[PDB]
Amino acid sequence: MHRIWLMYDPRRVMVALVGFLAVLALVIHFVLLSSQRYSWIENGTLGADQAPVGASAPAA
Amino acid sequence: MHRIWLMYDPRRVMVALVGFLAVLALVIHFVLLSSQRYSWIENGTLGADQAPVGASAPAA
Amino acid sequence: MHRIWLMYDPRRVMVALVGFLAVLALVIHFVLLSSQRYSWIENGTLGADQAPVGAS
Amino acid sequence: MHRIWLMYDPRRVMVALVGFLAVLALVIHFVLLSSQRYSWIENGTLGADQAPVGASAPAA
Amino acid sequence: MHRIWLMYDPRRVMVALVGFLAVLALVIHFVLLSSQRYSWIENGTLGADQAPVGASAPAAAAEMSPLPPGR
Amino acid sequence: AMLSFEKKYRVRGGTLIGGDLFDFWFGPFYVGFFGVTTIFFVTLGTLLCVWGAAMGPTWNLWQINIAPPDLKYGLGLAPLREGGLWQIITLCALGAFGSWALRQAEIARKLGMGMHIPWAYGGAILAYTTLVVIRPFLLGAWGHGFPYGIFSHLDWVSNVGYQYLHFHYNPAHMIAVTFFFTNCLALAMHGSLILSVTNPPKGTPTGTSEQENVFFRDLLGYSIGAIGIHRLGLFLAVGAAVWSAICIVISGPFWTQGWPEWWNWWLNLPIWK
Amino acid sequence: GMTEEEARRFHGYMVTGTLGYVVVASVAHFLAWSWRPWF
Amino acid sequence: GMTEEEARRFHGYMVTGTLGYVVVASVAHFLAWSWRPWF
Amino acid sequence: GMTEEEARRFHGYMVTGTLGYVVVASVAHFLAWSWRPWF
Amino acid sequence: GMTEEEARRFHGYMVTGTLGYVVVASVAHFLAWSWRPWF
Amino acid sequence: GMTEEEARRFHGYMVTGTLGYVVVASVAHFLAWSWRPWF
Amino acid sequence: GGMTEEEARRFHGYMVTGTLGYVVVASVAHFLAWSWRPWF
Amino acid sequence: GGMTEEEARRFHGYMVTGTLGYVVVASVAHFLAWSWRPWF
Amino acid sequence: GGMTEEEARRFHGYMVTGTLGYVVVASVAHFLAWSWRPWF
Amino acid sequence: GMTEEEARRFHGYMVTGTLGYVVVASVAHFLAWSWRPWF
Amino acid sequence: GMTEEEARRFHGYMVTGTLGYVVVASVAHFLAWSWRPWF
Amino acid sequence: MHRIWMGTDPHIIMSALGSFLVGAVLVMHIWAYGQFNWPATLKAKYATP
Amino acid sequence: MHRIWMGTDPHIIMSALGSFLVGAVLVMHIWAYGQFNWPATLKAKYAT
Amino acid sequence: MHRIWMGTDPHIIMSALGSFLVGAVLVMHIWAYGQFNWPATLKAKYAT
Amino acid sequence: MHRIWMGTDPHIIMSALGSFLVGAVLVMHIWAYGQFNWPATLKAKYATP
Amino acid sequence: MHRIWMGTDPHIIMSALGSFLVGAVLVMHIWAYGQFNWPATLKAKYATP
Amino acid sequence: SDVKFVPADNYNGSPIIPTGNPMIDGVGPASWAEDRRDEPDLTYHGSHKIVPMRLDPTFSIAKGDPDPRGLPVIAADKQVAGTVVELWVNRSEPQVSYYEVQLASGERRVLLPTGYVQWPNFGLWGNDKLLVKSITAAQFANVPATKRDDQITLLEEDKICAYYAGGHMYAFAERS
């Protein structure tokens, strides 16, 4: 399975992988920070039962 | 059957495949996240009968 | 029959076919997903009697 | 009639034909899907006695 | 784990790391300075019970809307 | 038909996709794989515009108006009669404009030219994609696109401008305008200089690079040189479209107030607050 | 360039594929007609 | 170029793969039709 | 240029990785179905 | 460009580095879940 | 260019540098936590 | 290229045989149909 | 290329046999269907 | 490379043994599950 | 591809596996019919 | 890669490690059952 | 009459005739199901009251 | 009668016929389930 | 009858047949769970 | 039957079989927990009023 | 049976097994804490009024 | 038949196929304007516009740029094609128009239009060799000659530039 590193230069792949993972992590953090339930800077100290929840089916 | 990898450079195919799957996965996740029914960051803790449902047909 | 592949390289046709079918599949899904009757992500759990019909 | 394939290169007449048929088929489907009578995705389950028919204003 | 320093030139990595950490530190400080709970220059002297907390629920009245009507 | 020097240049090679299959000409036009895809998207997108005119109120060329959907449809495909047709035409347009640029890259490769022309055209494609994909996506509805109609899109431009009360105050717009105006000046100067050395007053020898260099230096106070004036034209023309794309993408997604009150930061600099 | 024999050979397939395509289209039209007539 | 025996070999795969894809799609439509018919 | 024996061993990993990916997705879908089914 | 033994040595660090990261991230999710579950 | 001895001796300073930085940052976090907890 | 007169002569035999067979079966189908639901 | 006249003779035997088997099984299926729910 | 007929014969013995072991343990599990909560 | 000799041997296992599958399915259906008959 | 002789010794440790782990877990489940039985 | 076939590949003749017959038979059945009220009488025989 | 198979490929024939049968059989069953009201009567028997 | 397998690759035959059976069995089970009202009656046996 | 393994690599076989088993077992448990109402009865046993 | 390990790297095997066990054990505990109502009953034992 | 190319087939708009070596014959992107006037280009005062720098002492390298003379030239196949013996300058718009290269492992000296050279690291640092990405060190031997070494004609300019232009298509091809 290691012969994958003959197809691709690991010096490329390491830089590609870290670039991908850093971007993906920043996206997920900012998606959560922009949400209501997980806006943890302002509301992080709320207990789990007190945190916001999105609208349910209203039947109305 | 393994002779298919003589038709195409596997080094090229794997890059196209990973790209297609990465874009597809992001598109599906974004479609679901933008829905009502599956906006799981805000509403993921709702039970299945509490989760939104789209409108039904009129009675007549 | 097979002489079609003497005119068109099957290595290339097979790629263009995958490209065509992938775009066509995406177009048909996005059409259906946006309709009322087949908006299956919002309403897929409705029964076929409950599902919308575009009468007016 | 086969001598038409001496006037024109069959390799590229066939591309022109398949391209024509693709464009024509897509146009006709989109034209129908725009119509009210044949908007079959929403209303295809209606029987012909319920299907829309267009008329002019009754012009009293 | 030294072999990474042959895989990449230490000068370029050292500059890249310091550049990353400086950028990240500035981003996190300004995200906090913009927040209500952690706008420490104006409110840093407030006790932990007095500092702002995001709402467990926003308020409403049915007749009121933040957005004008339309379409 | 062929230019009297052309046949010599009509070799195979340089195609990015499809090998030799599409590597041929149709009259003056080079075809190639992206030639085929261009004609597909052009034909489909045009015939859907004709259908949009047919189901609309009039055939008058100026008044035809294929509008985008209501904002309530968000990022979904609307019913075709309610803006969905505009969305399909937009996908055709993107396909056509992309194919055209990639076809130009095949032509440039076949002639041994640099890639400058495809990339320059990329600046126009960027501005279009900003208007109909990126800005509507950042706003969350495809209905923020402009309608396809010769005067109805000018109504859209007017109303988008006044959504910010006084769009002249948009700082990126001022830069973009300055590029468009300076480009037109530079084009007039370069065109005039080349023509005036190659077409001197009757009974005068044909001019030289030295004469245009001298005259240009009298006009701007410095000598741009022959390569430099073409670099400057490309920089001004493409830069105009890039700054255009910036000025519209900041309007709404990033700035939502009137543009005059953006300049409040300048009035409040601490040296003179 | 192909011979007039190869032209006749190709033309045989081209006619046959055209006929097959027209047959499928004809059945599709008669299905569509029976579901929702347009005249 | 490609020899006629390679073309005849590939034609076997292409026909089989095409028809197998149509079979899988026909089953997907059978499932979709059972769930929510469009006529 | 890859040899036929290199292709032979490569394909085995490609099948294995594809099967592993489909397995993880199959569990991911069954978990999602148990949480909030879409039909 | 890697030799066999170079690639095989690198693959050891690459596997373990990947798995070590996923293990750390799984603890991060455990903590996040105990603070504020998303289902 | 960089030798294996150079890398080895560089790594020592690099690790104490990183560790000292993490020590300062973690003290800074615990001061921040004691002043105004975010959970 | 196609068929000589000799194989065409035997191909024709199967073509006429198959046609007559098909017409016989269709005749039985119409006889059954007519007895079941006459249409004139 | 393709099948010889020998292969054609041999293949035809299995082709006819498989067809007759399929039609036999389908004949049983229809007799069972008819006795379960007659359709004329 | 690839497994030889000799090696395959040996491999197959373990594979059969492991498969039987798995099925045996699963048979116990279903007996316990059935006596705990019968599903028919 | 396969020889006549390989085809002869492979066919025997294919027939055997097919018959085993049908036999197991026959017992499955007999159980299902006794449990919840469907006609 | 790993030789047969290494594999022979490796296997002996891996099985004894596995058996030990199962032993500890079996005690854990015995204790857990005596504390809070789940059937 | 057999001289008709001489120019032609028998597989093309079979393909063309097989296409026509599938087409005609399907059109005839779709048409006949409309006119004869069958299978509609079959469906009414077993529909749930 | 047999020599119609000359020049053909046995696997293409069996692929074509196999795929035709699948299509035909699926159409026939979906149609027949509609007309004969089965499995609908089966479903109604064991529904609650 | 065996010589239909000539010129094939047996690992492809086992791949195609394996893929068919896995699909066909899963389609049949999700269909059957609809008609037979099982596991629905099982779930109803153990509920609150 | 052991002829079937020829040309394959044991590690690929054991990877494929291992991944399949993980999948099927996980699916069967996720499904079984839905139908049998366990651990839900376990949870309700020790839950605080 | 030991022949399964031939060609593999011991450290990859231990790395993969170890990471599996960490993942499985963490999943099992957060699951079990949910079902068995522990440490919730522990917290309620020592919590203040 | 001396004719440089033949049609790929009889249909309208088909490509041509070179008969001989396209770089030498001048076909496709290797071709040049064959009717171009075979005379030197002139300054406004009528001196030769493009000349070797040794013929006009007005010109000198800008201080703190490298003088490229004596550097090796590295061809597309990474072989050393030669070393820079002289610069040719445009006297109407002062710039280096051509490097002149003393061929390694050969007798001959050839011109090299500076549009086809690049510096390592694009000139920012190093500057210890020249890179010619477009042709191999073998093909450097066939670069067209000027009739004289003190001047170049417009036809010779077209021929030389066309040679390096064709390389990006034909340098690594058996079509020779």
Ligand SMILES: CCCCCCCCCCCCCC(=O)OC[C@H](COP(=O)(O)OCC(O)COP(=O)(O)OC[C@@H](COC(=O)CCCCCCCCCCCCC)OC(=O)CCCCCCCCCCCCC)OC(=O)CCCCCCCCCCCCC
């Ligand atoms: C508003 C301010 C800004 C607005 C900005 C507006 C900018 C306008 C720029 C475009 C104008 C130039 C276009 C051009 O010259 O193309 C070459 C072509 C053919 O001549 P050729 O190239 O010298 O010779 C080649 C030909 O003889 C043999 O070639 P070949 O055998 O290989 O190929 C077949 C032929 C067949 O001809 C055609 O298919 C072309 C027919 C349509 C031409 C329409 C031109 C546009 C008219 C616009 C003015 C108005 C028309 C109403 O040749 C070809 O294949 C050539 C294909 C050329 C394709 C050019 C398409 C350009 C479309 C432009 C659309 C502009 C939209 C604004 O020329 C022509 O056919 C004649 C055009 C003459 C210029 C238009 C002048 C109109 C004056 C007023 C009416 C005069 C009545 C007599």
Ligand code: BCL
């Ligand atoms: C060093 C060579 C091997 C290795 C060899 C061993 C050995 C030997 C043992 C373990 C053990 C364990 N390993 Mg380890 N392990 C490796 C890589 C990993 C990785 C990973 C991300 O790559 C993970 C998640 C794990 C995880 C685990 C746990 C499942 C387990 C308990 C200790 C622990 O938490 O260690 C977390 C892991 C690490 C911090 C890195 C690995 C090295 C350190 C020193 C820990 C393991 C050694 C342990 C202290 C030995 C004590 C003496 C013996 C009990 C006689 N190992 C490396 C590649 N692993 C033990 C076990 O089976 O317990 C039941 C055990 O005896």
Ligand SMILES: COC(C)(C)C/C=C/C(C)=C/C=C/C(C=O)=C/C=C/C(C)=C/C=C/C=C(C)/C=C/C=C(\C)CC/C=C(C)/C=C/C=C(\C)C(=O)O
């Ligand atoms: C909104 O309403 C609006 C739209 C406005 C209303 C108006 C609509 C209008 C105006 C419509 C016009 C329609 C039209 C007009 O003509 C439509 C014309 C359609 C036509 C002609 C279709 C033809 C199809 C032919 C096909 C599919 C052929 C297939 C061939 C095959 C498969 C064989 C390939 C070769 C092989 C296998 C081997 C070769 C041998 C070789 C190489 C060898 O042996 O060497």
Ligand SMILES: COC(C)(C)C/C=C/C(C)=C/C=C/C(C=O)=C/C=C/C(C)=C/C=C/C=C(C)/C=C/C=C(\C)CC/C=C(C)/C=C/C=C(\C)C(=O)O
């Ligand atoms: C409302 O929405 C709108 C959009 C408006 C509605 C309208 C929609 C319309 C009009 C749609 C039209 C659709 C259409 C039209 O024809 C659709 C046509 C679809 C087609 C043709 C699909 C064909 C698929 C074929 C496939 C998948 C083949 C796979 C082959 C494989 C896998 C084998 C590869 C080869 C191998 C392995 C051998 C290599 C050699 C080897 C190994 C060797 O040599 O050794």
Ligand SMILES: COC(C)(C)C/C=C/C(C)=C/C=C/C(C=O)=C/C=C/C(C)=C/C=C/C=C(C)/C=C/C=C(\C)CC/C=C(C)/C=C/C=C(\C)C(=O)O
């Ligand atoms: C909103 O709803 C919308 C979105 C509209 C609805 C959706 C619609 C559509 C159209 C969906 C389409 C889905 C689709 C269609 O194709 C989906 C297709 C998915 C596919 C095919 C996935 C394939 C995955 C394969 C993987 C992961 C392989 C991994 C291989 C690995 C890991 C091994 C690599 C090699 C190694 C390690 C070294 C080998 C040895 C070497 C080199 C040596 O030894 O030398």
Ligand SMILES: COC(C)(C)C/C=C/C(C)=C/C=C/C(C=O)=C/C=C/C(C)=C/C=C/C=C(C)/C=C/C=C(\C)CC/C=C(C)/C=C/C=C(\C)C(=O)O
């Ligand atoms: C809400 O906000 C959002 C943003 C949304 C939330 C999310 C945030 C996210 C995603 C954060 C991610 C963070 C992260 C991810 O990896 C963070 C990673 C951080 C890291 C790796 C830090 C490492 C620091 C290391 C340092 C400082 C090293 C210093 C070394 C020194 C001093 C020694 C120098 C050498 C010397 C002296 C001599 C050498 C010898 C020589 C020369 C010789 O001997 O020759």
Ligand SMILES: COC(C)(C)C/C=C/C(C)=C/C=C/C(C=O)=C/C=C/C(C)=C/C=C/C=C(C)/C=C/C=C(\C)CC/C=C(C)/C=C/C=C(\C)C(=O)O
């Ligand atoms: C409802 O309203 C509307 C629609 C208006 C109502 C009106 C409808 C109308 C007007 C309908 C008209 C229908 C019609 C008109 O003609 C219908 C015509 C039907 C016909 C002709 C059917 C013919 C069928 C023939 C068959 C089945 C032959 C099979 C032959 C076989 C099997 C043997 C093949 C050859 C072999 C084996 C030899 C190989 C030798 C070789 C190779 C060698 O020897 O080398």
Ligand SMILES: COC(C)(C)C/C=C/C(C)=C/C=C/C(C=O)=C/C=C/C(C)=C/C=C/C=C(C)/C=C/C=C(\C)CC/C=C(C)/C=C/C=C(\C)C(=O)O
């Ligand atoms: C509801 O409303 C509407 C829809 C309108 C209602 C109307 C419906 C209509 C009109 C239906 C018509 C159906 C129909 C016809 O008319 C249907 C026709 C069906 C037929 C023909 C089925 C044939 C099946 C044949 C089979 C299974 C054969 C298998 C053979 C095998 C296994 C052997 C393989 C070969 C070997 C071993 C060779 C070895 C030697 C080799 C290789 C060598 O020697 O080389």
Ligand SMILES: COC(C)(C)C/C=C/C(C)=C/C=C/C(C=O)=C/C=C/C(C)=C/C=C/C=C(C)/C=C/C=C(\C)CC/C=C(C)/C=C/C=C(\C)C(=O)O
């Ligand atoms: C709920 O609704 C729905 C979901 C619909 C319900 C329906 C579900 C359905 C349809 C389920 C179907 C399940 C199924 C099949 O049908 C399931 C199939 C299960 C199977 C096959 C299990 C097999 C297990 C085999 C194992 C564990 C083998 C272990 C091997 C061991 C220990 C030895 C390894 C040693 C080696 C290799 C060393 C030798 C090397 C040597 C000598 C060397 O290297 O030389």
Ligand SMILES: COC(C)(C)C/C=C/C(C)=C/C=C/C(C=O)=C/C=C/C(C)=C/C=C/C=C(C)/C=C/C=C(\C)CC/C=C(C)/C=C/C=C(\C)C(=O)O
């Ligand atoms: C609900 O509504 C709708 C959906 C409409 C309802 C209707 C549904 C319908 C119509 C269903 C029809 C289903 C069907 C139709 O035919 C179903 C057909 C099923 C069949 C045929 C199953 C066959 C299974 C065969 C098996 C398991 C064989 C295994 C073989 C093995 C193990 C041996 C492998 C080889 C070896 C060991 C030798 C290697 C030697 C080598 C390599 C050497 O020696 O070289």
Ligand SMILES: COC(C)(C)C/C=C/C(C)=C/C=C/C(C=O)=C/C=C/C(C)=C/C=C/C=C(C)/C=C/C=C(\C)CC/C=C(C)/C=C/C=C(\C)C(=O)O
């Ligand atoms: C809650 O709902 C759901 C989740 C659904 C519920 C269901 C859950 C399910 C289904 C769980 C299933 C779990 C499972 C299934 O198998 C679990 C299986 C677990 C296993 C296998 C554990 C194995 C542990 C093994 C250990 C610790 C080994 C240690 C070995 C050591 C220390 C020796 C190392 C090597 C050396 C010393 C080198 C020697 C020489 C060398 C190198 C040389 O000489 O070179």
Ligand SMILES: CCCCCCCCCCCCO[C@@H]1O[C@H](CO)[C@@H](O[C@H]2O[C@H](CO)[C@@H](O)[C@H](O)[C@H]2O)[C@H](O)[C@H]1O
């Ligand atoms: C697109 C995904 C959906 C599934 C697609 C495929 C599903 C059906 C697969 C059936 C597999 C058996 O199908 C059969 O395979 C064999 C090889 O084994 C192919 O055989 C082909 O290659 C072999 C060997 O290279 C040649 O000897 C032969 O002349 C040629 O036809 C047959 O042409 C095909 O009919």
Ligand SMILES: CCCCCCCCCCCCO[C@@H]1O[C@H](CO)[C@@H](O[C@H]2O[C@H](CO)[C@@H](O)[C@H](O)[C@H]2O)[C@H](O)[C@H]1O
């Ligand atoms: C070529 C491959 C094709 C793959 C299959 C794709 C789907 C095509 C289906 C064509 C056949 C449809 O057949 C038709 O099914 C509908 C489904 O409502 C039946 O409709 C009737 O029965 C169904 C139950 O089965 C009821 O829900 C419905 O209200 C009633 O009208 C018709 O009585 C039958 O004639």
